[PDB]
């Protein structure tokens, strides 16, 4: 049994069924054509560097409900976006189904300045947590916001909705009921040189802005107590 969430995968996604892989668990949105959320579990055995990026349509989805590689033609020139990972390649590419990290269900059109800047620096610190001797797991949920019109990919006729922002909710080891946690939220237009430490939020803000309940297996009291309180995990990620 594959559990990429530990404390219950998010509720509230547009799809009632999620895709469960070793690399991640994902909840697709057939309207937006992107994942509502992607949950993953970093351990000492999951990172692998230098994997290549053969983008592919997710074979587990109906092709009408997701993007294909052709759909990104011209996107960078039109919109200054990259094919941005939701579950991060280098942190997870040691798993047995790693090629699924490059399925387009795990990709969105993410502004290059965000993808290559603060989002990447956050990914690097998130991955670095697992090197600590007393951290045995990092459990993350990531996903988009859909709050303003960001334009359309020129290379497709499909209806789709480019995200306006991206968020990441992280905890270590067992459960946020007992372990340090973090949440971050970045607009698409985040400057390239931005410090990811300046984008800390609460889990509650992300829930309000997505219609999701993250960590949905936690007791009610724990959810109510902790989700409105920003966490301290960022301090272990270099934030001061
Ligand atoms: Mg990226």
CATH level 3 topology: Extracellular Endonuclease, Chain A
What top-tier CATH class fits best? Alpha Beta
- Would you list the SSEs in sequence order as H and E? EEEHEHEHHEEEHH
Structural class: alpha+beta
PDB class: hydrolase
Keywords: Rossmann Fold, Hydrolase, Nucleic Acid, Extracellular
Assembly: monomeric
Entry title: X-ray structure of the Serratia marcescens endonuclease at 0.95 A resolution
List the defining traits of the structure above:
alpha+beta; 6 helices; six-stranded antiparallel beta sheet; metal ion binding; Extracellular Endonuclease, Chain A; hydrolase; 240 residues; Endo_G_ENPP1-like_dom; monomer; 20% strand; binds magnesium ion
Protein model, in words:
There is one protein chain. The protein is of the alpha+beta class and 240 residues long. It is built from six helices and eight strands, in the order βββαβαβααβββαα. The site of magnesium ion (MG) has 5 residues, from strand 4 and helix 4. The site of magnesium ion has 5 residues, from strand 4 and helix 4. It is classed as hydrolase.
Short structural summary:
The chain is α+β, with helices and mostly antiparallel strands. 16% of the residues lie in helices and 20% in strands.
What's the SSE blueprint?
Blueprint: E1 19-20, E2 25-28, E3 35-42, H1 75-79, E4 81-85, H2 89-92, E5 107-111, H3 112-115, H4 118-128, E6 138-145, E7 165-172, E8 181-187, H5 203-210, H6 220-226
The structure holds magnesium ion (MG).
